[model samples]
Target: GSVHKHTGRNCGRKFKIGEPLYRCHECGCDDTCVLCIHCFNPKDHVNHHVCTDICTEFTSGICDCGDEEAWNSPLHCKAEEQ
Candidate 1:
C-alpha cells in the first residue's frame, strides 16, 4: 500500500478548509483567486469583490452582515488583520 498525499487547495495560512473562503469575482483571476478570511486583505485585494456564492456560507449562519452586504463591508478587512 502507498500513502496518500492531500491535494486540496489550502488557504494562505495553510488551512485546508475553513469558512468564508473569498473569491475575487471582480478581477480576471476569479477562477483561481480563492482565499480564506485571514488572507483576504485589502492590501493585496483592494477594489476586488468577494464572490456572492462564498458569502452565502456566512449569510445563512451567524454573521454580522446578515446578508450579501458582507461583500462590501470593510469589517472583513479588519478581521483579516487579526
Candidate 2:
C-alpha cells in the first residue's frame, strides 16, 4: 500500500456542512480539494496520526481502486481480509 500526503493547496482546509468553497470542477480544485464524505483523508485512516480526536476504524488491503468509497469504506477494507 502507498501512502500519499496532501501536497496541494487544499490541505488543512476544513469543509463545513454549508460553507461554500467556490469549488470549480473546471479548475481542478475538485480533484485536489474535496469534502471528506466520511472524513477519511484528514483522519489518516491508513497512515500517520491526524485523526480529529475521533478515531475512525479502517480496514487496509491491496486492491487499490482509487475510488473514495472503495478506499474509505470499512466494508471494502474488510473485504481485503478474505
Candidate 3:
C-alpha cells in the first residue's frame, strides 16, 4: 500500500497517521502542507488548520501505528545517538 508520504517541510518527519498534525496552507512545498507539531508552527504557519488527529473521517480507513507525542518521544527522541 502506498501511503501519502506526508511529512514536515524541514524536519522531514513523516506525519504518523492519527497523530498530532497541522495543515499549514500558504507555506512550503505542497500548499496546505501537512506537518507534525515539531516542525509545525511559527504563527506564520499556525494560521492554518489545527489538524491534530488524522483519519478524522474514520471513514477513509487509515493505517500505521506509534505516535511520538504519546510515546514520550523516546524513539524519535533517541536521535539515533547509538
Candidate 4:
C-alpha cells in the first residue's frame, strides 16, 4: 500500500481532525491560504461553491503551493489520485 506519501495539498487524501478548511478567499496569500475537501482542482463539490467564506476546521495540516487568486492561475493538485 505504498505509504509515506508527500506533495502539496492533502496529496492522495490525508487530513482528518475536523475536516473543513476551504478558504479560496478567491485563492492565495500563502500566509493562510487555506484548502481542503481533500481533493483539489474540481468543479463538482457540493455542486460547486468553492469560495466565499467558511474558513478553518481541517486543523492545521498545511503544505500549500500556487494559488494565483481566483480563476486558475496557480492552484494545482498535479494529478496523482486513484
lDDT by residue (1-82, candidate 2, tens digit) is 4433332222333444443322113221233322333223322333422222221233211222233432233222221221
Residue 65, candidate 2: alpha-carbon lDDT: 25
Off by over 4 Å in 3: 1-9, 28-32, 46-82
lDDT of 4 at 82: 54
- lDDT over C-alpha atoms for residue 68 of model 1: 38
- The ten-residue window of minimal lDDT in model 4 covers 63-72
What TM-score would every model get versus the actual structure?
0.34, 0.20, 0.35, 0.24
- Between candidates 1 and 4, name the one with more favorable lDDT: 4
Stretches of candidate 4 above 4 Å error?
1-5, 8-10, 28-71, 75-82
- lDDT order of candidates, top first: 4, 1, 3, 2
Indicate the residue-level lDDT of 28 in model 4: 49
Question: Runs in model 2 with CA error above 4 Å?
Answer: 1-11, 29-82
Better of 2 and 3 by lDDT: 3
Best by TM-score: 3
Model 4 lDDT tens row, 1-82: 2323345423434346656545443444533555555435564233444552333463555434333342334555424345
Candidate 1 lDDT, 1-82, residue by residue in tens: 2322222322234323235645566532324434444434556456655563344423332222112333433323333233
Candidate 3 residue-wise lDDT, 1-82, digit = tens: 2233333212455555556555433443333334454433344433533444463434122221123332211222122122
Each prediction's Cα RMSD?
Answer: 12.6, 14.8, 11.5, 11.6
Error of 2 at 26 (Å): 2.6
Which residue pairs collide in model 3, if any? none
